[PDB]
Design a protein around this nucleic acid. Sequence first.
DNA 1: ATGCATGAGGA
DNA 2: TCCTCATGCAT
DNA 3: ATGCATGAGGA
DNA 4: TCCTCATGCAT
Lengths: 132, 132
Amino acid sequence: EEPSDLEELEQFAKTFKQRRIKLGFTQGDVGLAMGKLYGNDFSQTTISRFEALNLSFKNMSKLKPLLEKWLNDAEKRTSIETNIRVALEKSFMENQKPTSEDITLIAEQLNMEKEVIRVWFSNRRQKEKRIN
Amino acid sequence: EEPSDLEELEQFAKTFKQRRIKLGFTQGDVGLAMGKLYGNDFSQTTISRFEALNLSFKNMSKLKPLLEKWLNDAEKRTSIETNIRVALEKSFMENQKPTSEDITLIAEQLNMEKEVIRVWFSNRRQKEKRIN
DNA sequence: ATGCATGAGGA
DNA sequence: TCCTCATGCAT
DNA sequence: ATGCATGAGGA
DNA sequence: TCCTCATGCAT
């Protein structure tokens, strides 16, 4: 094993956030600098997820090398109802990956558009793969 | 959470390795291409650790964004004795972070240079923070 | 694929 | 000094 | 900081 | 179609 393991990534995240704050940069500032200085800008959202390890170990591993260059050098949409959420969570608990059919049922059952439900389960499986 | 969570990073790693092999590139080839095309070369070791998630979630998160640019576009040293290792592991089990004093003891006790032992525990704590 | 090491940054 | 974190030479 | 979404790539 | 994975707009 050559790449950073989980404990090391947690330390890098710690260090990165300290340096950013020490230097007076916002998460947004860093994301913008990454595009200006290294050719790949990142959003405030991604910088926030990285610093909190709210990403999978696979994604954190891709990003760490990129953010490390910065560190060295610096030196219509629909909103889901509260009750529908809980039920959705309950379902996720039963089956993490419902089929197109299971899903269609669950949609009508909750009276929600199919695509919205398909996406909710996709987002939920992704969140479950996050470190934090 | 915006960055990739653990499950998503595992999927990206899977995908990345499949594409690399499908395209006929070695891990070394990719590491070299990253320097030629994106300005930050990586070693075969890092590409191997990334593909196996033998890095922390923090480090995987840094690397994923960088390797993602590639993926899109492609489309004197001392050797430790076997018995000393086991004992060292036993020790690690008792105390993960021994002090300079604890360490010095353990060194003489095993008749090994101090620095070598300090480094072994540092490497061991790092390995423990890895996803895999 | 991985053991032993280095080096930057902060401790 | 000495840790953490990222990374890699040598094997 | 995070809910809901998109889009690339493969399934 | 439809998943996984990376990423972000809008809130």
